[PDB]
Design a protein around this nucleic acid. Structure first.
Ligand SMILES: [Mg+2]
Ligand SMILES: [Mg+2]
Ligand SMILES: [Mg+2]
Ligand SMILES: [Mg+2]
Ligand SMILES: [Mg+2]
Ligand SMILES: [Mg+2]
Ligand SMILES: [Mg+2]
Ligand SMILES: [Mg+2]
Ligand SMILES: [Mg+2]
Ligand SMILES: [Mg+2]
Lengths: 70, 151, 65, 116
RNA sequence: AAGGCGGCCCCCUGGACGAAGACUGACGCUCAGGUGCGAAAGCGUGGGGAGCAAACAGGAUUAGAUACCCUGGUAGUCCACGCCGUAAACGAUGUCGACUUGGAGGUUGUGCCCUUGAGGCGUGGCUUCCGGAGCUAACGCGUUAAGUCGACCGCCUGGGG
């Protein structure tokens, strides 16, 4: 995420622009993942358990959509 | 408490100089519930300070307060094995009512001849930026600044 | 929409780098299909096209070399 | 001495400390400052404030070189990763670019094992 | 086929699937005993050894701590060729058939029009999720059945020993 400051401006927009550049690049989301070694069976289990939970909320949204609370 | 928001009660202003801040000082000074003796102690002591140093007894008493009023203190918070302090600013009502407690406890320690003497001295040094009250204020300010990276 | 390579029914080629540079980020990583909308059949060709341009130095591996 | 005009500010932040080094554009360092030696040994050298003071110290000891403009180059994801740049701005330098040179391996060597 | 397979390029090679036609004409299904393949660890003989890291050593916490935590670290993990033949080798569900209301998706061919630009109309092969009838002890399965039926094989007969 190399950022060159532009003409004038104050320090903050370029600074806050830099942070947004790294968030898109996800540099911190990678270093913490490679900080320790996770076994390939844990790699697959974690991915699946995330997906099935992601789907389950997706179907449960329509169930609450049809019902009313009061 | 858990949920209640409490409105405090106004106390009667002092008889002589008509200032509730002074009337709160005697209340903190009073021990065992006897305003008659406590009001004598503060009145004689304040008269002693005013005679020696300047006029306007209300300002004479006030000058000590601006030298003892704290600004930031530390409240302990625990996370894991060890608990560390956290700095936090102090609300104005707390600042006025924290200074008087520091002065009174400081007065009770000085080994002078009588309570009217010890209170008279302690307000004198505080008005000159000195004494046990000011050092106790300094200890809080140094410790709040020794560890303040926490937030 | 999401139709860019659906009109150009071919194999995605590596000497045409003007097309490719819109599917890579600023750092040089490959944009996932979920963003550009490219379907799977043309993402794999696009992914291989980049790795064939990366070897021949026509495209940067990373942002800073 | 040698009155170097514009230099580079390498910041090696980490999960447990922070090291700030200011060099010339050729790569020959000038002076450094870390949170560990700044007076925060223990559980404090890993806070944004401790990194801030470290950068402030590094702004000194380079007066004999007359640095004015910097190329801040962040590394080592940790707490003192951004607060040490704005501290360099408090030093009066006008920085001209910011870079994140963090070593990301394309699946190289196997990392250590997990902690229980 | 199962184990399993992940940068790019080449040259050797196996199996799937679809369109429209030709040909052989029951050539089929299952399979005791046999034969082959079979993660990781392990073994033998040569190489290689960056990073991890059993054993091992030191530091710490602890009543103790031959552990968890920290600092180092050898066999091993890597290559070639031979052995070993086991796993929660797990959709804990044998293989091959025909039949029995529906939705939401993924991926891969296709034949039409409406190459009217996006688009709609149909037909195949795998795969994910939800669910009707039915099934059952219940959980649950449910057109890829644990439903309704055939053909062969394997196995089960109280717990511990
Ligand atoms: Mg470690
Ligand atoms: Mg047999
Ligand atoms: Mg092995
Ligand atoms: Mg061996
Ligand atoms: Mg050997
Ligand atoms: Mg170890
Ligand atoms: Mg067995
Ligand atoms: Mg398996
Ligand atoms: Mg079994
Ligand atoms: Mg179901």
């Amino acid at each position: 995420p190399v950022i060159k400051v532009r003409e004038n401006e104050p320090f903050d927009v370029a600074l806050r622009r830099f942070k947004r550049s790294c968030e898109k690049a996800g540099v911190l989301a990678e270093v913490r993942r490679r900080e320790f070694y996770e076994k390939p069976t844990t790699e697959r289990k974690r991915a699946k358990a995330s997906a099935v939970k992601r789907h389950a909320k997706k179907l449960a949204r329509e169930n609450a959509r049809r019902t009313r609370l009061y | 408490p858990r949920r209640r928001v409490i409105g405090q009660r106004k106390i009667l202003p002092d008889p002589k100089f008509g200032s509730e801040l002074l009337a709160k000082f005697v209340n903190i000074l009073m021990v065992d519930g006897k305003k008659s003796t406590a009001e004598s102690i503060v009145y004689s002591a304040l008269e002693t300070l005013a005679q020696r140093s300047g006029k306007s007894e209300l300002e004479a008493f006030e000058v000590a307060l601006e030298n003892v009023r704290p600004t930031v203190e530390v409240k302990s918070r625990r996370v894991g094995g060890s608990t560390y302090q956290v700095p936090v600013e102090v609300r104005p009502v707390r600042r006025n009512a924290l200074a008087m407690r520091w002065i009174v406890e400081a007065a009770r320690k000085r080994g002078d001849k009588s309570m009217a003497l010890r209170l008279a001295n302690e307000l004198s040094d505080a008005a000159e930026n000195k004494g046990t009250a000011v050092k106790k204020r300094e200890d809080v300010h140094r410790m709040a600044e020794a560890n303040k990276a926490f937030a | 929409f999401c139709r860019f390579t659906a009109e150009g029914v071919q194999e995605i080629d590596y000497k045409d780098i003007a097309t490719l540079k819109n599917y890579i980020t600023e750092s040089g990583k490959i944009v996932p299909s979920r963003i550009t909308g490219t379907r799977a059949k043309y993402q794999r060709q696009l992914a291989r096209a980049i790795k064939r341009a990366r070897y021949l130095s026509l495209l940067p591996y990373t942002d800073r070399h | 001495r040698k009155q170097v005009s514009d230099g580079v500010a390498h910041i090696h932040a980490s999960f447990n400390n922070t090291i700030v080094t200011i060099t010339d554009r050729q790569g020959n360092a000038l002076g450094w400052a870390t949170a560990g030696g700044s007076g925060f040994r223990g559980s404090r050298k890993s806070t944004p404030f401790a990194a801030q003071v470290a950068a402030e110290r590094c702004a000194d000891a380079v007066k004999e070189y007359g640095i004015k403009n910097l190329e801040v180059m962040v590394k080592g994801p940790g707490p003192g990763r951004e607060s040490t740049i704005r501290a360099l701005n408090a030093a009066g330098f006008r920085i001209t670019n910011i870079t994140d040179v963090t070593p990301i391996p394309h699946n190289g060597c196997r990392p250590p094992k997990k902690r229980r």
